[PDB]
């Protein structure tokens, strides 16, 4: 997260870390045993870490649970990143308390201008590199469809929304993939891709969660 601030301890209780040796993507806990992340974060073996704040130190609030089911959206296109969403069913339910909680799915899509909260343990620099121990947070508005499309001509699908600033400076970055974008207490986006990080006129592109509420629900009910 470039241009963000260190989140307050357990201010983002639904944030999880996908680990396969080391942190590689983020995710969100939607219910005691299901995690939502980006389909491009797909790996055949995944360990989900919950209750994390500082990822380099065991603080005593952590829950490390292996993924049982790993389902990528049926229409995920690896080249265009369209339908970049994935569902993970934990092999055991997570224990909910103060540091571990669920995030709510959206009833409908967010309107442009809505302020959201993005978080992750990704790169905090747009030119160099620096990875934080502590979870980073960033407040950024959902951009209009026209602005998103003019920023990335011919690359924005109906399942993608731009969130961030056209002036650059603040944005999600490598290591934040699959993380949450929460607006009004609802998960509206999943960190997906972009032209570098925090570049002028190149806001981050995020998977539009509101288009997948029905799929998510059907999948959880059927598994």
């Amino acid at each position: 997260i470039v241009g963000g601030y260190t989140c307050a301890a357990n201010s983002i209780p639904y944030q999880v870390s996908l680990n396969s040796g080391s942190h590689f993507c983020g995710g969100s806990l939607i219910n005691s045993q299901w995690v939502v992340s980006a389909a491009h974060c797909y790996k055949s073996r995944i360990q989900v870490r919950l209750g994390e704040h500082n990822i380099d130190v065991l603080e005593g609030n952590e829950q490390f649970i292996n993924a049982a089911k790993i389902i990528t959206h049926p229409n995920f296109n690896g080249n265009t990143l369209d339908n970049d969403i994935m569902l993970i069913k934990l092999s055991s339910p997570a224990t909910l308390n103060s540091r571990v909680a669920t995030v709510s799915l959206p009833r409908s899509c967010a309107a442009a201008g809505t302020e959201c909260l993005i978080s992750g343990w990704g790169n905090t620099k747009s030119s160099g590199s620096s990875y934080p121990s502590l979870l980073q947070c960033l407040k950024a508005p959902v951009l209009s469809d026209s602005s998103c499309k003019s920023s990335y001509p011919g690359q924005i699908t109906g399942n993608m929304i731009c969130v961030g600033f056209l002036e650059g400076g603040k944005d999600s970055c490598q290591g934040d993939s699959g993380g949450p974008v929460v607006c009004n207490g609802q998960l509206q986006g999943i960190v997906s891709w972009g032209y570098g990080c925090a570049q002028k006129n190149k806001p981050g592109v995020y998977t539009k969660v509101c288009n997948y509420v029905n799929w998510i629900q059907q999948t959880i009910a059927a598994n």
């Binding site: 590689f24 993507c25 974060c41 790169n123 290591g175 960190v191 972009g194 570098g196 981050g204």
Partner: protein, 46 residues
Amino acid sequence: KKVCACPKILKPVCGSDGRTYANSCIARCNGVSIKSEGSCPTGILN
């Protein structure tokens, strides 16, 4: 720079000379051939 449209995943790769990239997409973006997967020591000087 040589920045491109790439997914924001952190899956380091090693390249030429001794520089390691955030992920493969970033590597191919620059040009650097993926020598091996993972970061890399004396195959870069940071």
